[PDB]
Amino acid sequence: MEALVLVGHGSRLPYSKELLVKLAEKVKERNLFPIVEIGLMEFSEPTIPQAVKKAIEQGAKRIIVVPVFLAHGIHTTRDIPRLLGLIEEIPEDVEIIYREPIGADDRIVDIIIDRAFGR
Amino acid sequence: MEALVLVGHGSRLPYSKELLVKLAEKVKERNLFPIVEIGLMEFSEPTIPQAVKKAIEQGAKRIIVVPVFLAHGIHTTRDIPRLLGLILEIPEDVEIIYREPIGADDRIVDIIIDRAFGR
Ligand SMILES: O=C(O)CCC1=C(CC(=O)O)c2cc3[nH]c(cc4nc(cc5[nH]c(cc1n2)c(CC(=O)O)c5CCC(=O)O)C(CC(=O)O)=C4CCC(=O)O)c(CC(=O)O)c3CCC(=O)O
C-alpha cells in the first residue's frame, strides 16, 4: 500500500546506478516495504518520474521518496521536489512523502574511519 | 605523524561544507588521528590542495585522503587524484594514500530505512 523510492543523482559513469541498485537489493532483503523502486535524477534510467509511476502501477497509495544524497543541495532542494510535483507527473490521489538526505550521521563517521584504515 | 583529510564535493549552497565540518568534528572526538583536515573540490574553502598543505605544515608524513562521496565518478576517479598529484608541491618524505568512497555499505541501508520512517 506504500512504496519506497530511492532517488540518486545519476552519472555518465556506471558507478552511481550500481550503488542504487545494490542499495535497493539490500533493502528488499529486509522485507519492510511492499514495493521498492529506484530513480536517477539525470543521465540514466529509470528516471525519477518513471520510478514513481512504476510504484503507483503496482498499487501504492503512499510513496516514500528517500534522497540518497549525503547533503542538501540544489538537487534535493529544487530539482527533485519539482519532478515530484511538490513545487511549482500526475499523482493520482496518492500521497508523496519526501524524506531527508543522509546528513552527518554517526554511522557515516563509522564508515569514514573504516575507509581510512583500508577496511 | 599521519593526517586524515576528508574531501567533499562543495556546493554553491552551505549544506555540503557544514556536513564535512560536522564530520571532521565527530572524528576528532574519537581521538584516532593526530591531524584532521577537510577540503572541498569546488566552490568553497578550504580547497583540497590547501588541506593537504595544512596537514603537511603540522608535520604529517602520511596523508590519508578519504573521499566523502557515496559512489565513484569523474571527481573521485579523475579530478581529485589530479589535485593530489596522483596522475601540488609534495615533499618526498611525505606519501598521500587515497582511500575509497562510501559505497553500498550495510550501514547506509540502515540509515536509508531510518530516513524512510522519518527518523
Ligand atoms: O557542467 C559539467 O558537466 C561539469 C560539472 C558537473 C558535473 C561533473 C562532470 O560531469 O564533469 C557534475 C557531475 C555531477 N555533479 C555532481 C554533483 C553535483 N554538482 C553540483 C552542482 C552542480 N554541478 C553541475 C555540473 C556538474 N555536474 C551543475 C549543473 C547541473 O547539474 O544542473 C551543478 C548544479 C548547479 C545548478 O544547476 O544551478 C551539485 C549540486 C549542489 O551540490 O548543490 C552536485 C550534487 C551534490 C554533490 O555531490 O555536490 C555529481 C554527483 C557527485 O559527484 O557526487 C555529478 C555526477 C557524478 C560524476 O561526477 O560522475
From Swiss-Prot, chain B:
Binding site for Ni(2+): H9, H75
Residue sites binding substrate per the record: E45, L70, A71, H72, G73, I74, H75
Disulphide connectivity of cysteines: none
Enzyme Commission (EC) number: 4.99.1.3, 4.99.1.11
Biological pathway: Cofactor biosynthesis; adenosylcobalamin biosynthesis; cob(II)yrinate a,c-diamide from sirohydrochlorin (anaerobic route): step 1/10
Keywords of the record: Cobalamin biosynthesis, Cobalt, Lyase, Metal-binding, Methanogenesis, Nickel
Catalytic reaction list: Co-sirohydrochlorin + 2 H(+) = sirohydrochlorin + Co(2+); Ni-sirohydrochlorin + 2 H(+) = sirohydrochlorin + Ni(2+)
One GO BP annotation of this record: anaerobic cobalamin biosynthetic process
Active-site annotation: H9
Domain of life: Archaea
Residues annotated as binding Co(2+): H9, H75
Gene Ontology MF terms: cobalt ion binding; nickel cation binding; sirohydrochlorin cobaltochelatase activity
Pfam families recorded: CbiX
CDD domains recorded: CbiX_SirB_N (cd03416)
Gene3D superfamilies in the record: 3.40.50.1400
Main function: Catalyzes the insertion of Co(2+) into sirohydrochlorin as part of the anaerobic pathway to cobalamin biosynthesis. Involved in the biosynthesis of the unique nickel-containing tetrapyrrole coenzyme F430, the prosthetic group of methyl-coenzyme M reductase (MCR), which plays a key role in methanogenesis and anaerobic methane oxidation. Catalyzes the insertion of Ni(2+) into sirohydrochlorin to yield Ni-sirohydrochlorin.
Subunit and partners: Homotetramer; dimer of dimers.
Similarity comment: family membership: Belongs to the CbiX family. CbiXS subfamily.
This protein's name: Sirohydrochlorin cobaltochelatase
Organism: Methanocaldococcus jannaschii (strain ATCC 43067 / DSM 2661 / JAL-1 / JCM 10045 / NBRC 100440)
Phylogenetic lineage: Archaea, Methanobacteriati, Methanobacteriota, Methanomada group, Methanococci
Gene that encodes it: cbiX
